[PDB]
């Protein structure tokens, strides 16, 4: 059986997971949902713990500890280790009873519980790309310390990349060690997108359109942060880093072609020629399932992709004077050291302006242009602690003169 | 360095063979070409000898033989063991510095050639589709006997198949066993067709097309027999029951797409309902250099696929009534037993009659349904020689069968 714990429970990712878990526990035993982690929900998990009665329960907000106490004294015949706090998640990474760990928060809460997950040795399915963008120096030398720690990408994107590698060949290595590629013969990625909202939109359509525009009838329900992401374009551009990152693919070899109909998810050129492709129905239930079955695959009920039905599949080049975003993440990553790190915190901020009404589509890559201008490559620590801390500085400085630049040309 | 024999080394497949062989050579001294077998071409063979110096030169024909070694003296510093007919074949497939045979011979000298490499415990890259067809349970048993042979497909769609499979699984087994899919975890298979020139005729056109219309300026330039089952779908009728037998999966699981554009060449729905294909432009070389790769790949100077000029890929369901050769594929399938020695046998006479302007279009699926109506099921044989010889006897029943009908409607 597979012990598994997930970190963001409440969120789209930890829903998702425990869906698909559910189903398929419903047709085989697979899965012991050992923890659940939230950050406020105390309703929410009340009936999480009531359906999986894990043998872990978190919050980091402390506020709520006690309130979860109680209501979990309505479950019959259960004890669980009720925990919170950064301190709660360190005690759910280091159980000997937790085999895998999904970690589905973002920003800071996800790169720590992340570090500390692979601290203990585990499986983390990360579908948290700004930690991989952000933190991928630091990532690669704590994998490299802790061998036995993996990480598999929930990424849906990035989940079809490592599904058409051949298992014989990755299970001598593993992501985001040096030589990935080479031992799994990968010459070149088809990285593919939506395209999202604002793909067909002309130039003089493009300087006016709005977040409501963006948010309002979307293809696909999301949070409000990648929603952004994917009318800009800078969610490819952050999954451009990941998959340097992820499996050691140089930024010449990442292709981004707009896939309008999001059935196939990405393609792998080898290097006899030969490309791969995953595909599936838009739904996050296969890369999470995947990134906890692998190298295995387990039965589903899914619905069956009906090709037939589907009956069309387009390709094409996207506008980089459309979509300045994918310019700048590639700069951005070719020129490395932590430029990477500035081009996501920059954005964080950009991003957020723009949610909010404050600055227009072009303003977005305009500010995150100048602030990685004003970025001066630095020495990177070799200490990994000493790097964690310069990568978070980096992170503050940049978010800050993202908004000086903000607040001067108001 | 990887050890080859190549039978019918002047046909498309042995021809399309050298020229990987020759071109990925450029790059690194990957292969070794032991063998040269051809049936009469002695300019051709000698040619081929001055190129690849193999250590072993075969022809069947008996009347060229000594043609053969007086050409071979002008070859400075070569030596070959020169040999002839069906004795010389047995020779090569017994060599111990021979490792893998590429079979791109058909009909009889087909099937007794991947006979004798399996006896020999060889890798055996099949091209001939209607072995596999008419003598499956016969290779499944010397399979069985011979736990070292190995078929490795090199038909497009069937390598294709094979390409989408996880080798740590694929090495666990091999093809044509018994468990196969159960153990590649395998749900279901989309055998993409190109269709062929007829998929707008309405079934009054069909009527009245001629082998000419099949022929003339056709899509993709290959032999006259294939071109033919192109034009009917027995062509993928065939590969249904190939399927079948190479990868265990049941018939109510594999589904006919037809895919004009011939870039996916086939998907594997695997049993969570991911699915994975393989791409490139048509081009034999591909699954040829597979064959003789697997379970590795090398570097190749091939055009790369650039998906977005290719732009737009479709899918659509085939008519079973406009195609019936389909229908009676699945329906011999199904059946069991020596119906597909029999689909196979009549379709080589059904097939030919149209070429040569003998018969109509809905003739050919008349005939061959009529030879299946006329066979009686017979108990299958549990020595491997006498199940040979009832192959044989079948195929050969089926064939005046066929004939007789013509005759007597003639
Ligand atoms: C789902 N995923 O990993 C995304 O990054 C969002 C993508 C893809 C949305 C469609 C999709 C694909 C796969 C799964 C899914 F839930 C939804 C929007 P893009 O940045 O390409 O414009
Ligand atoms: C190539 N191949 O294995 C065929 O069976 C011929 C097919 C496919 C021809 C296109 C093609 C695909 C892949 C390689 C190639 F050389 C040519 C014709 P169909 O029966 O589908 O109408
Ligand atoms: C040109 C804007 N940036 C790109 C990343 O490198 C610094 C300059
Ligand atoms: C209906 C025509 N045939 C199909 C194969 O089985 C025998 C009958
Ligand atoms: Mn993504
Ligand atoms: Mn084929």
Same mark, same amino acid.
């Given at each position: 059986?597979?012990n598994?714990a997930?970190?963001?429970?409440?969120?789209?990712?930890?829903? /998702?997971?425990l869906?698909?878990?559910?189903?398929?526990?419903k047709?085989?035993?697979?899965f012991?949902v050992?923890?659940?982690?939230?950050?406020?929900?105390?309703?929410?998990?009340?009936?999480?713990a009531?359906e999986?009665?894990?043998?872990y329960?978190?919050?980091?907000?402390?506020?709520?500890?006690?309130?979860?106490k109680?209501?979990?004294?309505?479950?019959?015949?259960y004890?669980?280790?009720?925990?919170?706090?950064?301190?709660?998640?360190?005690?759910?990474?280091?159980?000997? *009873?937790?085999?895998?760990?999904?970690?589905?928060?973002?920003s800071?809460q996800?790169?720590?519980?992340?570090?500390?997950?692979?601290?203990? /040795?585990?499986?983390?399915?990360?579908?948290?790309?700004?930690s991989?963008?952000?933190?991928?120096?630091?990532?690669?030398?704590?994998?490299?310390?802790?061998?036995?720690?993996?990480?598999?990408?929930?990424?849906?994107?990035?989940?079809?990349?490592?599904?058409?590698?051949?298992?014989?060949?990755?299970?001598?290595?593993?992501?985001?060690?040096?030589?990935?590629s080479?031992?799994?013969?990968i010459?070149?990625?088809?990285?593919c997108? *939506?395209?999202?909202?604002?793909? /067909?939109?002309?130039?003089?359509?493009?300087?006016?359109?709005?977040?409501?525009?963006?948010?309002?009838?979307?293809?696909?329900?999301?949070?409000?942060?990648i929603?952004?992401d994917?009318?800009?374009?800078?969610?490819?551009?952050?999954?451009?880093?990941?998959?340097?990152?992820?499996?050691?693919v140089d930024?010449?070899?990442?292709?981004?072609?707009?896939?309008?109909?999001?059935?196939?998810?990405?393609?792998? %050129?080898?290097?006899?020629k030969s490309?791969?492709?995953?595909?599936?129905?838009?739904?996050?239930?296969?890369?999470?399932?995947?990134?906890?079955?692998?190298?295995?695959?387990?039965?589903?009920?899914?619905k069956?992709?009906?090709?037939?039905?589907?009956?069309?599949?387009?390709?094409?080049?996207? *506008?980089?004077?459309?979509?300045?975003?994918?310019?700048?993440?590639?700069?951005?990553g070719?020129?490395?050291?932590?430029?990477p790190?500035?081009l996501?915190?920059?954005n964080?901020?950009?991003?957020?302006?723009?949610?909010?009404?404050?600055?227009?589509?072009?303003d977005?890559?305009?500010?995150?242009?100048?602030?990685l201008?004003?970025?001066?490559?630095?020495?990177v620590?070799?200490?990994? %602690?000493?790097?964690?801390?310069?990568?978070?500085?980096?992170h503050?400085?940049?978010?800050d003169?993202?908004?000086?630049?903000?607040?001067?040309?108001?």
């Open positions: 059986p597979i598994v997930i970190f963001g429970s409440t969120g789209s990712i930890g829903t /998702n997971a869906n698909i878990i559910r189903e398929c526990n047709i085989e035993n697979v012991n050992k923890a659940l982690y939230v950050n406020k929900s105390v309703n929410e998990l009340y009936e999480q009531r999986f009665l894990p043998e329960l978190c919050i980091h907000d402390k506020s709520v500890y006690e309130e979860l109680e209501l979990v004294k309505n479950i019959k015949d004890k669980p280790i009720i925990l919170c706090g950064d301190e709660g998640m360190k005690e759910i990474c280091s159980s000997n *009873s937790i085999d895998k760990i999904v970690i589905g928060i973002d800071f996800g790169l720590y519980s992340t570090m500390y997950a692979i601290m203990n /040795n585990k499986i983390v399915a990360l579908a948290n790309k700004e991989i963008v952000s933190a991928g120096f630091f990532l690669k030398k704590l994998l490299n310390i802790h061998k036995n720690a993996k990480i598999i990408p929930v990424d849906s994107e990035h989940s079809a990349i490592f599904q058409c590698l051949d298992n014989n060949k990755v299970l001598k290595t593993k992501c985001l060690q040096d030589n990935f080479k031992i799994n013969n010459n070149k990625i088809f990285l997108s *939506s395209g999202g909202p604002f793909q /067909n939109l002309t130039m003089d359509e493009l300087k006016n359109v709005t977040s409501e525009n963006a948010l309002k009838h979307p293809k696909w329900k999301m949070g409000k942060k929603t952004i994917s009318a800009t374009m800078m969610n490819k551009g952050l999954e451009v880093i990941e998959t340097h990152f992820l499996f050691d930024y010449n070899d990442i292709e981004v072609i707009v896939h309008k109909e999001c059935i196939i998810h990405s393609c792998v %050129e080898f290097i006899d490309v791969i492709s995953q595909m599936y129905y838009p739904d996050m239930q296969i890369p999470i399932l995947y990134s906890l079955t692998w190298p295995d695959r387990i039965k589903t009920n899914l069956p992709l009906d090709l037939a039905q589907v009956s069309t599949l387009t390709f094409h080049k996207p *506008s980089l004077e459309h979509f300045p975003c994918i310019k700048l993440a590639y700069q951005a070719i020129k490395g050291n932590f430029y790190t500035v996501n915190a920059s964080e901020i950009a991003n957020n302006l723009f949610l909010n009404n404050k600055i227009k589509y072009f977005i890559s305009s500010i995150i242009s100048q602030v201008e004003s970025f001066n490559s630095q020495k620590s070799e200490n990994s %602690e000493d790097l964690m801390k310069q990568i978070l500085q980096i503050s400085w940049a978010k003169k993202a908004t000086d630049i903000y607040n001067k040309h108001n």
